[PDB]
Amino acid sequence: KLKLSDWFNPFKRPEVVTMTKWKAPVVWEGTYNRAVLDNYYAKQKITVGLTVFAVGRYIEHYLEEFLTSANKHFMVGHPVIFYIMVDDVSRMPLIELGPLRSFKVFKIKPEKRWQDISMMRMKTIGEHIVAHIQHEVDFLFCMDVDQVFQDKFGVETLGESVAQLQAWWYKADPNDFTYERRKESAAYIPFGEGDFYYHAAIFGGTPTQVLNITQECFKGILKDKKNDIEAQWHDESHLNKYFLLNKPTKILSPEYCWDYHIGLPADIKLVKMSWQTK
Numbered sequence: 077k078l079k080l081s082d083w084f085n086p087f088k089r090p091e092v093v094t095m096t097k098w099k100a101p102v103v104w105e106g107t108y109n110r111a112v113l114d115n116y117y118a119k120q121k122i123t124v125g126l127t128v129f130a131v132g133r134y135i136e137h138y139l140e141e142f143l144t145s146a147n148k149h150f151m152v153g154h155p156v157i158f159y160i161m162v163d164d165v166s167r168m169p170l171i172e173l174g175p176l177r178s179f180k181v182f183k184i185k186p187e188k189r190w191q192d193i194s195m196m197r198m199k200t201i202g203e204h205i206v207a208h209i210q211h212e213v214d215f216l217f218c219m220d221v222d223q224v225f226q227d228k229f230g231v232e233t234l235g236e237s238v239a240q241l242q243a244w245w246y247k248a249d250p251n252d253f254t255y256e257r258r259k260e261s262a263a264y265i266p267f268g269e270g271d272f273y274y275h276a277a278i279f280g281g282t283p284t285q286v287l288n289i290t291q292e293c294f295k296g297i298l299k300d301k302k303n304d305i306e307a308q309w310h311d312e313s314h315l316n317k318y319f320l321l322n323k324p325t326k327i328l329s330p331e332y333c334w335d336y337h338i339g340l341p342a343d344i345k346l347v348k349m350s351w352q353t354k
């Protein structure tokens with residue numbers, strides 16, 4: 077059916093990494109033919125899902141900007157369902173959605189520690205994949221709420237398993253990655269090992285793969301807590317361990333999740349999504 081040559085040309089971005097040793101593309105602005113993919117996926121009649129959690133003061137503020145920008149830039153041309161997880165549903169703001177967009181809201185019990193809020197996402201996402209999302213969408217993205225779409229974030233990002241390159245580390249040496257380095261943690265990665273440092277603010281894939289991502293991360297979170305240890309960067313450490321062992325079939329460049337606090341080097345041609353201030 078579809079082959080990499082049909083839509084992806086790595087040679088259009090020669091100054092950056094565009095392919096991995098396991099044959100996965102790194103999608104940079106200029107390398108992809110979105111028109112070919114729009115037509116390809118429209119034939120298939122796909123629906124894309126997007127989960128976001130919002131707890132505490134995050135609820136009304138970031139969520140409005142996130143959803144407003146998402147409705148504007150996320151997978152335009154194809155049906156989308158927004159899955160919104162909140163602790164108090166009263167905080168859910170009213171965002172008018174465009175054609176073929178809808179949403180569902182669920183009330184979640186907020187955890188005590190800010191670290192468990194972020195990590196408990198993994199369990200909750202898996203539960204809703206089994207309960208309904210596996211029957212509602214063909215691809216699924218899970219995103220932090222404290223970020224904002226800036227340009228088209230389209231079907232060029234879809235794949236079996238999708239990882240995001242952390243903007244601060246994509247040109248760094250693996251020995252400088254902030255992996256979990258304690259052998260006692262399930263997320264342990266030795267020095268000299270690792271392909272990239274992936275950002276936990278964006279990951280996706282088919283519901284099947286996302287279930288495995290979130291189930292395996294959650295089990296590592298669980299094993300760690302039972303040994304009274306918490307990974308350096310919590311779920312992100314476990315996600316990086318997971319993608320080390322289970323290579324993503326597609327990687328998104330830092331253009332798809334950029335921190336302007338870095339600046340704007342020549343590598344970043346067109347930002348599709350940017351961090352919010354932390």
Ligand SMILES: O=c1ccn([C@@H]2O[C@H](COP(=O)(O)OP(=O)(O)O[C@H]3O[C@H](CO)[C@H](O)[C@H](O)[C@H]3O)[C@@H](O)[C@H]2O)c(=O)[nH]1
Nearest residue numbers: 129130131132134193194220221222276277309310311312
């Ligand atoms: O009080 C809270 C805490 C967390 N969150 C949710 O958890 C996400 C992660 O928290 P932050 O965005 O505040 O922190 P970071 O930018 O440091 O998050 C990054 O590091 C985390 C681990 O520390 C996770 O790996 C996360 O996926 C990754 O984007 C938020 O986007 C939000 O969706 C809330 O809604 N409210």
Ligand SMILES: OC[C@H]1O[C@@H](O[C@H]2[C@H](O)[C@@H](O)[C@H](O)O[C@@H]2CO)[C@H](O)[C@@H](O)[C@H]1O
Nearest residue numbers: 242244245253254274275276309312354
């Ligand atoms: O290292 C993972 C961690 O990165 C944070 O980003 C830091 C970055 O690591 C640091 O080099 C730079 O000086 O400041 C950035 C902003 O604090 C992310 O904020 C965090 O979520 C993790 O992804």
Ligand SMILES: [Co+2]
Nearest residue numbers: 220221222277
């Ligand atoms: Co964040």
